[PDB]
Write an enzyme that holds these catalytic residues in place. Structure first.
Site, short mmCIF file in Angstrom:
data_model
loop_
_atom_site.label_atom_id
_atom_site.label_comp_id
_atom_site.label_asym_id
_atom_site.label_seq_id
_atom_site.Cartn_x
_atom_site.Cartn_y
_atom_site.Cartn_z
N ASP A 175 -1.01 -1.35 3.73
CA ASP A 175 -1.53 -2.69 3.61
C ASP A 175 -3.04 -2.72 3.94
O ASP A 175 -3.81 -1.83 3.58
CB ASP A 175 -0.77 -3.62 4.57
CG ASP A 175 -0.71 -5.06 4.08
OD1 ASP A 175 0.37 -5.48 3.60
OD2 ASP A 175 -1.72 -5.77 4.20
N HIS A 190 -2.57 -9.13 7.51
CA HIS A 190 -1.36 -8.80 6.75
C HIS A 190 -0.60 -7.56 7.22
O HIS A 190 0.58 -7.64 7.52
CB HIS A 190 -1.72 -8.66 5.28
CG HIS A 190 -0.62 -9.09 4.35
ND1 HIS A 190 0.23 -8.21 3.73
CD2 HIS A 190 -0.25 -10.33 3.95
CE1 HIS A 190 1.09 -8.88 2.98
NE2 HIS A 190 0.83 -10.16 3.09
N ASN A 232 5.48 -13.31 -4.69
CA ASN A 232 5.51 -14.71 -4.26
C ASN A 232 5.22 -15.60 -5.45
O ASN A 232 4.53 -16.61 -5.31
CB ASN A 232 4.43 -14.99 -3.20
CG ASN A 232 4.71 -14.30 -1.89
OD1 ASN A 232 5.77 -13.71 -1.70
ND2 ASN A 232 3.77 -14.39 -0.96
N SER A 240 6.30 -10.56 1.82
CA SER A 240 5.74 -9.48 2.61
C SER A 240 6.29 -9.61 4.00
O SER A 240 6.02 -8.76 4.85
CB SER A 240 4.23 -9.55 2.74
OG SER A 240 3.60 -10.02 1.59
#
Ligand SMILES: [Ca+2]
Lengths: 4, 284
Positions: B41, B72, B164, B227
């Site tokens: 990430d 994140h 998403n 996530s």
């Protein structure tokens, strides 16, 4: 890409 | 050795029980110990106290950004194995920054990150398994599905975010790769999160809405997304691998789908599995  | 953690984020209570509502997270003490988890990430804030020295951010493919300054990756690493917010509480975390801090990564830099984690995983002490997290996505790129597929082929349990977009995952990567464990997101009232992608290519669902986890700057944050559901899965697998033994990379996704609670979710369209993660808790 991007973080989700 | 099953212990329980009271007042745990709903997401952990949701995975150690068949029925919703529990705030207690019940799991075996081994807690995915002897296992390794790679978080691909924006990086992971290792210094964070919630990782109890078990996290180290080791590589970056972003110019002069060798730190998670986005949030994140650290939020996702907290769900995988942080003391209070994670599934696999004895696991070892390794960060590979493939997305810069504005939250952007080239496919090339991402493919390089996946290989780095595979090659690096063999230089680490992971007797009971290597798992991987990719809570990122973009338009469909074969190159990425292929680099993703290769991780699977090397024995790394790679789980990736469905997306998403409230759309079929088939059109994104690493999401559309048949071989990785793609994860959809779940609500605490057992509904598919309004934004969660779906489709035949999604292999499992896990807590994805209102998930509390570690955050940069020594804190915690509560965010929603696929996530957030993905590290529930990557962590669930490390845990099952340190407890039952690593069965294979795709076999671990398969094992997860076998343990999963069935037909309890709403909002799940035809063609999409109705599987909600469950950690096998005897008294669940
Ligand atoms: Ca898949």
């Amino acid at each position: 890409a991007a973080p989700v | 050795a099953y212990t329980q953690q009271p007042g745990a984020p709903w997401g952990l209570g949701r995975i150690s029980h068949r029925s919703k509502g529990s705030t207690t997270y019940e799991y075996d003490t081994s807690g995915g110990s002897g296992t390794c988890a790679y978080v691909i990430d924006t990086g992971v804030e290792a210094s964070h106290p919630e990782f109890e020295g078990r996290a180290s951010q080791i590589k970056s493919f972003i110019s002069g950004q060798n730190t998670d300054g986005n949030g994140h990756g650290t939020h996702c690493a907290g769900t995988i194995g942080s003391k209070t917010y994670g599934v696999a509480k004895k696991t070892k975390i390794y960060g590979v920054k493939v997305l810069d801090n504005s939250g952007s990564g080239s496919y090339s830099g991402i493919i390089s990150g996946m290989d780095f984690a595979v090659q690096d995983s063999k230089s680490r002490s992971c007797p009971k398994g290597v798992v991987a997290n990719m809570s990122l996505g973009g338009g469909k790129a074969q190159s990425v599905n292929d680099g993703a597929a290769a991780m699977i082929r090397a024995g790394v349990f790679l789980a990736v975010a469905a997306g998403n977009d409230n759309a079929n995952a088939a059109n994104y990567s690493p999401a559309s790769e048949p071989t990785v464990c793609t994860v959809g997101a779940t609500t605490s009232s057992d509904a598919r999160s309004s934004f969660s992608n779906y489709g035949n290519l999604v292999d499992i669902f896990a807590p994805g809405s209102n998930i509390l986890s570690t955050w940069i700057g020594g804190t915690t944050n509560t965010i929603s997304g696929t996530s957030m559901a993905t590290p529930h899965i990557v962590g669930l697998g490390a845990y099952l691998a340190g407890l039952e033994g690593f069965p294979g990379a795709q076999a671990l996704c398969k094992r997860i789908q076998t343990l999963s609670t069935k037909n309890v979710l709403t909002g799940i369209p035809s063609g999409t599995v109705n599987y909600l993660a469950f950690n096998g808790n005897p008294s669940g």
